[model samples]
Target: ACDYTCGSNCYSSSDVSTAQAAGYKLHEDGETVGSNSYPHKYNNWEGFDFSVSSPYYEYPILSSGDVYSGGSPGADRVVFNENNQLAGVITHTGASGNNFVECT
Candidate 1:
């Protein structure tokens, strides 16, 4: 996840270059959630769904009320903070939607 005009901020910028991201989609900020460090989701509308959602997504687009859980889909671009830990998240807001996470 990267910085968008919406909810919680992830990366510093939104335009991620393949050369800088090491070949990740969307925004790549030289951060990896590591093996089994993060989780995934689908049809998501909230936070990291590690239990219910399937085919997980690291960067979940939650402008609706749906959510997917499982896997480390969005962890590929996860940045390792100064604490040497995985942190931060992203989300979006809609008139009729709940706490759904969006990229841009």
Candidate 2:
């Protein structure tokens, strides 16, 4: 299976770091294709059996008092306009990764 490319546009193990550097996170559960979220077939590849996805959008998951701040697994922060409306999501990881933001 080493020589097997699996399929077209197939990625290798090195793509892991590449993806990580690009702010994409890896997932633990490998679901069947056609899902709205994941679509990578990493089972055949070494060190790449996980699906990768960047945060598309986010909403309030945790709350404080003054300002509500919570996000999906990969987003850095939610941007808002002057009218306090939804703007766009900024990703900080691949798939479902870590959140480094802290309160000080």
Candidate 3:
């Protein structure tokens, strides 16, 4: 069974972990990848309740089950904190232009 569902895409915990790890690493190194510059600040504009603290970062979590490299970030993302703690998975699929909705 899928651990999380984002629009038509499904993801497992491992997928989230992989994406989170990559994002966190780049954040720690003060580096970014892709045109949108992933591992960038996530302002939490949606105001979803998250267990982790602020200073969050957003990174692409591809449905193809591969780590995000560049190009076409799709609509899904994995949000993490400065402590490398996962905030949650979110997607633009169900939300209005550029906004995000939490993955289930």
TM-score of each candidate? 0.24, 0.20, 0.97
Clashing pairs in 3: none
Give me the overall lDDT of model 2.
0.25
Q: lDDT per residue, candidate 2, 75-98, as tens digits?
A: 232322223333332233332353
Question: What is the Å distance of residue 89 in model 3 from its true position?
Answer: 0.2
In angstroms, how far off is 1's CA in candidate 2? 35
Regarding lDDT, does 1 or 2 come out ahead?
A: 1
CA lDDT of 19 in candidate 2? 33
Give me the runs in candidate 1 sitting further than 4 Å from their true place: 1-3, 8-36, 43-56, 59-98, 101-104
TM-score, candidate 3, is 0.97
Alpha carbon lDDT of each predicted model: 0.32, 0.25, 0.93
Give the residue spans of candidate 2 off by over 4 A. Answer: 1-75, 95-104
State the displacement of the C-alpha of residue 85, model 1, in Å, after optimal TM-score superposition.
Answer: 26
